[PDB]
Amino acid sequence: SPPLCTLPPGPEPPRFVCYCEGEGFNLYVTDAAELWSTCFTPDSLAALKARFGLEDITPRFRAACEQQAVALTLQEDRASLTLSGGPSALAFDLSKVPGPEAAPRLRALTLGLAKRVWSLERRLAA
Amino acid sequence: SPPLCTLPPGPEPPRFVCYCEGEEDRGGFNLYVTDAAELWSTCFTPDSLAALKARFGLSAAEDITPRFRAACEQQAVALTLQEDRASLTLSGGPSALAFDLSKVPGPEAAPRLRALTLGLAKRVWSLERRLAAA
Numbered sequence: 001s002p003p004l005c006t007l008p009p010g011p012e013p014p015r016f017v018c019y020c021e022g023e024g025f026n027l028y029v030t031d032a033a034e035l036w037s038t039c040f041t042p043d044s045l046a047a048l049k050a051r052f053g054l055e056d057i058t059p060r061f062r063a064a065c066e067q068q069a070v071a072l073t074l075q076e077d078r079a080s081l082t083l084s085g086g087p088s089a090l091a092f093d094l095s096k097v098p099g100p101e102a103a104p105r106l107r108a109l110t111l112g113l114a115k116r117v118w119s120l121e122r123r124l125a126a
Numbered sequence: 127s128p129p130l131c132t133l134p135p136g137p138e139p140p141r142f143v144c145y146c147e148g149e150e151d152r153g154g155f156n157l158y159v160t161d162a163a164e165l166w167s168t169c170f171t172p173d174s175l176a177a178l179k180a181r182f183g184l185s186a187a188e189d190i191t192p193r194f195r196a197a198c199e200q201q202a203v204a205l206t207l208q209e210d211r212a213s214l215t216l217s218g219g220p221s222a223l224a225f226d227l228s229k230v231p232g233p234e235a236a237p238r239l240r241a242l243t244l245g246l247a248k249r250v251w252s253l254e255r256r257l258a259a260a
Contacts, residue, residue: 001254006247017247032240056150099165106243110162113142115132120235120253124260 003061003118009068018070018081019109020061027061027081028105029072034124035102036079036094052090060086127249129194135201143242144203144214151188157194157225158164159205159214160242161243165235166212193219 004019018029025045027038040048049055064070065082071082079094097105128147132140141161148155155175157168170178176186184190196218197203204215212227230238 004247004251006244006251013241014248015243017210017244030243032243033236094163107162108139110243110246111132111143113243113250114130114143114145115140116250117246117253118131120250120257121127122255124257 001089002112003065004059005065005068005070007070007072009070016072016073016074017067017109020058023056025057027094028109029074029081029094030102030106030109031081032106032110035097035106036074037097038092038094039097048092052088056104061091127253128193129198130181131198131203133201133203133205135203136141142205144194144198144205145242146191146194149191154168155190157214157227158230159212159227160239162239162243165230165238167230168225169228169230178223178225182221189221193223 002019002021003019006014007016007018008014016029016031018027020027024040026040028034049057060083063085067085069084071084073080073082077096079096081092083090083092083095128145130143130145133142133144134140142159143162144157146155146157147153154170154172155168156170159166179185179188179190192218197216198216198218202217204213204217206213211227212214214225214227216223216225229235
């Protein structure tokens with residue numbers, strides 16, 4: 001079950017979603033109109049783990065999502081996503097994803113959430 | 127929590143979401159179907175809702191939401207697209223209900239989809255939170 005979380009974590013309406021993908025591995029955040037991504041190459045991911053020490057990012061991110069310990073800074077075409085939980089706070093630089101690239105991902109994201117809801121509501125009934 | 131389902135039912139990747147709104151401030155009922163690119167709605171008026179509920183022998187004070195919820199549960203929802211227009215069929219129950227949908231305009235459709243994506247994610251996070259307990 002692909003981890004994600006929403007911001008603000010309050011009862012206020014969520015204004016952003018943060019999620020991640022396969023370990024092509026990446027972090028994403030969107031306000032559902034624009035999409036920001038870490039945009040990792042397999043080289044720069046290792047560089048990141050190395051700067052930070054490792055060797056899997058997903059569990060740290062899952063852990064921050066559960067704790068609602070994710071911090072988000074957005075200015076323009078650049079974002080930063082911060083993970084608190086582990087030994088060192090983790091920060092990620094994100095760049096805005098061009099519309100034609102972001103678009104099929106946003107489409108797939110929404111349709112995928114819905115299938116998760118339908119499915120989760122099934123399971124919960126059991 | 128608000129009823130929805132995805133199509134196609136089964137293991138294949140979803141191409142469409144069906145959901146509904148209203149019948150709580152209580153707002154008029156509408157059904158919405160989307161491929162997450164375009165949005166369609168029942169675009170009900172009070173007259174058209176009465177006329178639909180008559181077309182299939184339902185009453186004015188009757189909520190439609192429970193039957194839609196029942197179609198969603200059983201994945202007994204049928205969809206047609208002329209692109210220009212749509213049909214939705216509910217077969218969750220004893221009697222089938224068919225709906226005419228038209229395209230929702232952009233300046234209204236766009237903010238509804240954003241809210242849908244974000245709302246699902248809240249729902250997912252909350253549901254997945256609510257599930258770990260049992």
